[PDB]
């Protein structure tokens, strides 16, 4: 369903065009409209977004601006009921080009960079305590990593370890606090959009070291294989991604020439992408999540 009373919107927070952005905007698939909402307190690109208990969280990132460039350890929370951002406890370390996933109401922050450091560390946020705690680190240092959750397991996909862009991927098993490699993708991808739909982890787009990608592949956890699906209409890296009522939406990114405003929607029943709207301005490195309409 789409309940609150209210529908669910696709929120895009932050991003990058010439400098890091503070925009918070919300798209409504049911009518095509965009709403501009309360700016982030600090501009940030390379952040991740997620939702827990109806609240939107913005995690990590970096503020690229002429004043200077500052990697972010911030966790900030947006309440659609109040149109207000509130600071939460900060992470143990700044994490630019972070990946995030939610299990059992807990936020996992994965990887990312801090200056020339590439993290394998992972930490977990408990909103009921407003506390972060480190957990087992990944087997691999990963920035520009895509993260998704399927069947209460956390997956970290692709990225960049400081020297090589990665096709590798790994899975975190919470009850054993353990990471294990899974089958690698068929394509090297950093800055891909990663999400979950039905029983598959999707990895769309990204950068393979030479080109921005339009190819899309998905990992069936039952068969442990990756297979390509229809490619997106636009090549893009540093895209935002989310799932809304059974379809995948990809937002913006960089195609090697333009910071895209294109939003594309994947229908898995027909294996086709369509353009569904344009963001109000081209940008990359956004955080995206889905929650109730604001007030
Ligand atoms: O500064 C950035 O966030 C990246 C820009 C790009 O991909 O060209
Ligand atoms: O896990 C929760 O508390 C709810 C998350 C959501 O709003 O989807
Ligand atoms: O591999 C990188 O460093 C960047 C990838 C991207 O543009 O998202």
The verdict on the CB of residue 285 being under 6 Å from ligand 1 is yes
How far is it, in rounded angstroms, from Cα 227 to Cα 98? 25
The verdict on the CB of residue 58 being under 6 Å from ligand 1 is no
State the closest ligand 1 atom to the C-alpha of 62, by its place in the atom list counted from 1. Answer: 3
Domain of residue 214, residue span: 1-295
Which ligand sits nearest to residue 46's alpha carbon? 1
What are the Cα distances from residue 161, in Å, to 157, 171, 182? 12, 17, 17
Q: Is 72 in contact with 62 (CB distance < 8 Å)?
A: yes
The verdict on the CB of residue 254 being under 6 Å from ligand 1 is yes
For this experimental structure, what is the resolution in angstroms? Answer: 1.8
For ligand 3, the distance from its centroid to the CA atom of residue 192, given in whole angstroms, is: 9
Which ligand sits nearest to residue 56's alpha carbon? 2
What are the Cα distances from residue 120, in Å, to 46, 93, 117, 142? 17, 12, 10, 6
Is residue 214 left, alpha or beta, with left meaning phi > 0 and alpha meaning psi from -120 to 50? alpha
Torsion of CA 68, 79, 265, 207, to 10 degrees: 30
Residues near 62 by beta carbon (within 8 Å), at least 6 away in sequence: 20, 44, 45, 46, 69, 70, 71, 72, 94, 96, 97
How far is it, in rounded angstroms, from Cα 114 to Cα 264? 31
Phi/psi of residue 21, each to 5°? -110, 150
Nearest to 209 by CA among 167, 259, 264: 167
- Residue whose CA is at the smallest distance from ligand 1 atom 7: 254
Q: How many structural domains is the chain composed of?
A: 1
Distance, first Cα to last Cα, the chain: 20
Method: X-ray
How far is it, in rounded angstroms, from Cα 260 to Cα 258? 6
DSSP class per residue in 152-170: TEEEEE--B-SS-B---EE
What are the Cα distances from residue 118, in Å, to 16, 55, 171, 185? 21, 29, 19, 21
């Amino acid at each position: 369903v789409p309940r609150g009373m209210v529908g669910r919107l696709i929120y895009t927070a932050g991003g990058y065009f010439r400098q890091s952005l503070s925009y918070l905007e919300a798209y409504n698939p049911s009518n095509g409209s965009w709403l501009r909402l309360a700016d982030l307190q600090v501009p940030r690109s390379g952040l991740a977004g997620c939702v827990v208990g109806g609240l939107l969280y913005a995690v990590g990132g970096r503020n690229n601006s002429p004043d200077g460039n500052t990697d972010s350890s911030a966790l900030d929370c947006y309440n659609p009921m109040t149109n207000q951002w509130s600071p939460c406890a900060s992470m143990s370390v700044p994490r630019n080009r972070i990946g995030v996933g939610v299990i059992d109401g807990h936020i996992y922050a994965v990887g990312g960079s801090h200056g020339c450091i590439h993290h394998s560390s992972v930490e977990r946020y408990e909103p009921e305590r407003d506390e972060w705690h480190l957990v087992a680190p990944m087997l691999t240092r990963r920035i520009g990593v895509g993260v998704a959750v399927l069947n209460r397991l956390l997956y970290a996909v692709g990225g960049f370890d400081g020297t090589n862009r990665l096709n590798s991927a790994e899975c975190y098993y919470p009850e054993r606090n353990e990471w294990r490699m899974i089958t690698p993708m068929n394509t090297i991808r950093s800055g891909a959009g990663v999400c979950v739909l039905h029983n598959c982890i999707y990895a769309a787009g990204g950068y393979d070291g030479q080109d921005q990608l339009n190819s899309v592949e998905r990992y069936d956890v039952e068969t442990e294989t990756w297979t390509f699906v229809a490619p997106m209409r636009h090549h893009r890296s540093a895209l935002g991604i989310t799932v809304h009522q059974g379809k995948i939406y990809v937002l913006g990114g960089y195609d090697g020439h333009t910071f895209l405003d294109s939003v594309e929607c994947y229908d898995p029943d027909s294996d086709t992408w369509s353009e569904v709207t344009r963001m109000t301005s081209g940008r990359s490195g956004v955080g995206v999540a889905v929650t109730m309409e604001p007030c």
